[PDB]
Design a protein around this nucleic acid. Sequence first.
RNA 1: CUUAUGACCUGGGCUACACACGUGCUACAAUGGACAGAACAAAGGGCAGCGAAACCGCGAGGUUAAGCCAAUCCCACAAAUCUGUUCUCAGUUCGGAUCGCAGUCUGCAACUCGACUGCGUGAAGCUGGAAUCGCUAGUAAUCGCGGAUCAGCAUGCCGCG
Lengths: 78, 108, 176, 63
Amino acid sequence: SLKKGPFVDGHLMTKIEKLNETDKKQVVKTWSRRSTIFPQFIGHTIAVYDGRKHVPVFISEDMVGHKLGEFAPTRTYK
Amino acid sequence: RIAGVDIPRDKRVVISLTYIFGIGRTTAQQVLKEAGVSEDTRVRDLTEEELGKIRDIIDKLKVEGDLRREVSLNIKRLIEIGSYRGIRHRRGLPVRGQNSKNNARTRK
Amino acid sequence: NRLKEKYNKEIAPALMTKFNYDSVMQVPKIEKIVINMGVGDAVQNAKAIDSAVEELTFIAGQKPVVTRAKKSIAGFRLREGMPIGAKVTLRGERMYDFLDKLISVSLPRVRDFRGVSKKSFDGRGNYTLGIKEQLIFPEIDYDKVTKVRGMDIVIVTTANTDEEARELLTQVGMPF
Amino acid sequence: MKAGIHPNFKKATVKCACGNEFETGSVKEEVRVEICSECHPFYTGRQKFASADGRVDRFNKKY
RNA sequence: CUUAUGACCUGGGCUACACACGUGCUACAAUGGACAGAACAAAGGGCAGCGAAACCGCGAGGUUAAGCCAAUCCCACAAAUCUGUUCUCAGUUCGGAUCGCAGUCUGCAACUCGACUGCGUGAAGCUGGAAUCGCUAGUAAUCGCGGAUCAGCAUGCCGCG
């Protein structure tokens, strides 16, 4: 939460913009649940590590400002 | 009355307009100063034009009939959007990262 | 009165051109507005209806009628014979007087207002409305009200289909 | 009208806060109206002139 | 065991939650609350540090930056207190819990999982059963203020008046 821009790790960026540049289709892997979502990754799918398993999730239009860690619940319950 | 809601009539106007949904003490006082209607009045015996020139300013700020629904729409957006924060809101667990071992009887 | 003049002058001609009626007195006409109070009595306090009666005689222009329960049902502990709910019908100049108050002051004074329901119809040109607050016209002495049960509003017209009543109530002044 | 059992009915004009008129009857004699059907924004056609309204989904960290 | 109970790396967990126990903090109010004014301490810390004044910003803070390796300079405007105005005994101008919105700082990074600010919303709670504890005077009870740990984080601890 700071006005010098939201914070991501660069390598996953480079692959995902070349991905949406040439061929939008298939899924992208990550171990980093830390990157802030940018509003130009609408429609894709990301396999995010929860600490134990890679989980796919779909990014919609309203998915702005969050991080990808909001959707891989690390801990379960009843 | 003022914006739908009535006002306790025998008190000071600065205390009295905080009973409406959307302004607290600090926000009420500065719009009341811009209104310029004394700010140390009993609302029981003020006059009608000083009663009415605040209607236009509370129209351009926002109150219960809009804040209630926008916070509702935003919070159900957070509900069905699939967030961890949304599912915590759904399950009644605390949201601001507080520990659920010993407390949060305010919820659940 | 004003509404009667406008209905005579412009409302009925506009719709009779619009539905192309051969006889001009086939025009749909609003017949009765009835206001029905219902109290969840069930022998809890006798004074609830004994307050709503003179509240409604202030809301309307005349005294209502205490409705009679038809049959007993113990699912509310409702014994047949002890009174529940009130009713009053309005017609004449009185109905236009009440609809005047409604459109002019009442619905704009509701705590929150969106448009009236699109399809509260019967299917045969009658309409029913449900309001939650007694604050209809502001010169009810609002400090004397204790209970918060609002009112039931039933307008009955000579409309045979829903569409004619739907269209006529627009130029009556119901928002949708 | 059974006389006595009905309250008195008489002419009772309307003064909205905006000053609009209406030739009205009531059991009272006079009503002050804070908001009329010509200024309450839903009956202003559709938000004609009473509005502080709008909603976007804005995603802007470019400052 | 060296073809892992040894290393490396990322992410998660150590912060979960139907309940219970303990230790603390804060309240339930007019010996009060809000607003204005007037004061009065000790003891420590500061160089990959303290960072003045001034300006910007409502505020967290931001900007250029003075001085100080310190009985010089900085941290650093102590609070309780007193005087006056108001509130007029209520779930309240009490109480602020939890939430939504917008931000500040730090750090590669604040989601699990930090603290702070301006907002709006405003919880329960109107002195607490059986019980049970500390305390022989600068003590108890209250009032703030430092330090360590330290990128940022203290209601805990240590010490000060």
